[PDB]
Nucleic acid binder design. Sequence first.
DNA 1: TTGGTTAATAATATCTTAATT
DNA 2: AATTAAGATATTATTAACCAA
Lengths: 219, 221
Amino acid sequence: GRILVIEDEISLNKTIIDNLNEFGYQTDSSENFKDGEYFIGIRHYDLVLASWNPDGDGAELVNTIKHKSPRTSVMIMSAKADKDTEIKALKAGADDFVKKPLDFDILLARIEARLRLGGTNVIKIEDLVIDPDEEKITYKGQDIELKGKPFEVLTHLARHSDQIVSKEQLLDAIWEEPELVTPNVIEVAINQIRQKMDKPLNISTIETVRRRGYRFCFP
Amino acid sequence: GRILVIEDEISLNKTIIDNLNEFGYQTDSSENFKDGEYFIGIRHYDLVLASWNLPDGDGAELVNTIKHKSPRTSVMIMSAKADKDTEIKALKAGADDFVKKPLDFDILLARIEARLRLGGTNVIKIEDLVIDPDEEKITYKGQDIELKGKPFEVLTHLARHSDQIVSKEQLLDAIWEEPELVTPNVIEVAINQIRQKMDKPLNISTIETVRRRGYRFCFPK
DNA sequence: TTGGTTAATAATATCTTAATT
DNA sequence: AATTAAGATATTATTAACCAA
């Protein structure tokens, strides 16, 4: 929710900030690029709203923002609304081009859409993240080499944490033709998980409950 | 990049399809929500361009459908009624952009291209790696590498989805006109040519294979 | 018995070439 | 350049023997 605005009109700059704050956005402000590039250096801003028109290096501005702070969105506001200025701003890297006099109902809607994030299937528990989409596990910032069916078994359990899952359940949930395989696979997979993480990373992620099943228990 | 065009006006539909094909995009055409959704189910589209006023089917409904079915598909709404309420509604419904009809195809293509950069610049610059999709050129340390065609498009698509896993089936839908006809091995051969021209000679790790998922660009490594 | 623990080996995936186009 | 065919090679999955309790 961090947006910084680079506008040399004080009125507009004042205006723009008050609108963003009203919406809910943490915001910073600059009247020149010099100061602006400074802020992006200190902390990340989800989006940057800057004027195309003092130094007149907007095309370069977009580039420098994308370089210094690659994850940020650049929105360019310009009173010259001709196709040439629109096309040239987008072609320079701008993620969106808005037109001033500013419609703040439309602007807020575009910023929103520009910072809309898709729902994820990612699981973050304490210093551990488990990303099914990328088949990735990291604890304490280090990747864990766990994949395949052991990966699915761990993720399944994580999704049903504090709940006891049974071999049959895991098999049906993760194994096609579950009635054509050796249940030993579950035990082997659990060992793999303990081996890859529990053991080397000194944690207790999976717990076995006699005659009932396993349960993710990483507090 | 594959673009799904949903538009009832048959004449406009073909004009849009022709402008996109000319640019170099793979394109499918539809004239109703149903047909559109059909395509959304069989093929992966990097971007859907849909009229807010189809003969049937709430525009908001269409946006939700595509966004849920394919969260990473960009949605762009076109409407001759382009008052503020309409634009804001579409954006809030989940659209990433809203453009007024009659379309200025110069600005349309500039905006489509800005959405498909996934936040990037036109010229990808990573470390001493340069990938210029505009000149189909690649440089490393200012030294030129000859890589063109499908392999070039496979690599640029990966590097734009960098650090993400793109499946063989996604690479095909994005670069091949008829992904169903071609064999998935074509992707593996392209990845071999990419490694054969870059990773091996330049001693770098750019494409990571992830078994059963696909390929991921990891040049930063 | 129950679970875990190893290890080999069968499956399955991906890659690399060479040819054809 | 583009696509495929086939074997080469890599990587999981499966299976079972084995151990401890």
